[PDB]
Amino acid sequence: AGVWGLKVRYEGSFEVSKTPEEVFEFLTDPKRFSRAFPGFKSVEVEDGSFTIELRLSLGPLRGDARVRASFEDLEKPSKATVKGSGRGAGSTLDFTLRFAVEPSGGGSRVSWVFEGNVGGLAASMGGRVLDSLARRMINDVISGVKRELGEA
Amino acid sequence: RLHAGVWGLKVRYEGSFEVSKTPEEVFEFLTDPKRFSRAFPGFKSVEVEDGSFTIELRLSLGPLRGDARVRASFEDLEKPSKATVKGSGRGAGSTLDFTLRFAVEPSGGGSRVSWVFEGNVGGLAASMGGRVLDSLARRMINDVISGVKREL
Numbered sequence: 350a351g352v353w354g355l356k357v358r359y360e361g362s363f364e365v366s367k368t369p370e371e372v373f374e375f376l377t378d379p380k381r382f383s384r385a386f387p388g389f390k391s392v393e394v395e396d397g398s399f400t401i402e403l404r405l406s407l408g409p410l411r412g413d414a415r416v417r418a419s420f421e422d423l424e425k426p427s428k429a430t431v432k433g434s435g436r437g438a439g440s441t442l443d444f445t446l447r448f449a450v451e452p453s454g455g456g457s458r459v460s461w462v463f464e465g466n467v468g469g470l471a472a473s474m475g476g477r478v479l480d481s482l483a484r485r486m487i488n489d490v491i492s493g494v495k496r497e498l499g500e501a
Numbered sequence: 502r503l504h505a506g507v508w509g510l511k512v513r514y515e516g517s518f519e520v521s522k523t524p525e526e527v528f529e530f531l532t533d534p535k536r537f538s539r540a541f542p543g544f545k546s547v548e549v550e551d552g553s554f555t556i557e558l559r560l561s562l563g564p565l566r567g568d569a570r571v572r573a574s575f576e577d578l579e580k581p582s583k584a585t586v587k588g589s590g591r592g593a594g595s596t597l598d599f600t601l602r603f604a605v606e607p608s609g610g611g612s613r614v615s616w617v618f619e620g621n622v623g624g625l626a627a628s629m630g631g632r633v634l635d636s637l638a639r640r641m642i643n644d645v646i647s648g649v650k651r652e653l
Binding site for chain 2: 352353354355358359360362363463466472475478479483484
């Protein structure tokens with residue numbers, strides 16, 4: 350026998366003009382933050398847990414995908430953790446996302462760490478390709494966050 | 502983009518091979534780094550102290566070609582049959598963190614060696630498609646097993 354899967358970690362931070370309270374509220378409201386995702390299709394929210402359906406264009410990795418997740422840590426207006434899984438037509442993701450919001454000149458800095466395990470179709474693609482695709486998703490989400498908050 | 506990420510490939514291989522020697526003879530060989538390191542193609546050096554060891558290799562695998570170092574320790578031991586080796590390795594562009602477990606059992610008078618190798622691969626080895634790394638990994642495994650047979 351011989352088998353494999355991928356482990357991934359990303360970390361970063363970005364700044365927005367909004368107050369930490371306004372930013373934390375947005376980043377803990379799935380109905381609002383789901384619209385930051387490229388290819389957003391729908392969201393369901395209850396009891397701190399949510400599922401987002403997306404159309405992926407990312408792509409060798411394409412088509413409908415579903416992310417199901419729950420808040421764990423949730424300390425207003427400064428820190429949150431989300432744990433969940435993602436599925437497309439042939440791939441799996443299990444992940445943890447931790448973020449912090451701090452005052453930054455009356456604006457906010459959002460700092461974040463994503464860790465995940467990827468299985469299925471995608472586990473073959475190798476890190477150079479997957480990094481390209483992951484960076485597209487991250488940039489699109491962060492741009493979406495800035496857009497939905499009314500930055501610029 | 503103030504974000505960065507890294508990908509690692511988690512791999513598991515399992516196998517068995519037979520050898521024309523007694524379990525005690527095979528087990529002694531497989532627990533003496535001065536003996537078993539010679540099984541590695543590209544072997545340059547091994548230094549032992551006690552139950553812990555550092556091997557330096559010239560790899561020619563590869564895309565994966567160059568100087569490599571592994572530092573490992575025997576972590577579990579059952580003096581005719583079983584052992585565990587845990588360690589880590591690096592070249593100029595890739596990393597490895599691994600556990601190898603083996604059992605030396607009797608068979609046909611002689612012995613059979615059954616083993617499981619689990620690795621987290623980083624860097625260049627992880628950036629390539631998982632399918633390319635798999636072919637290289639099994640090539641190395643085959644060359645090492647051949648080297649074991651030769652040395653014995």
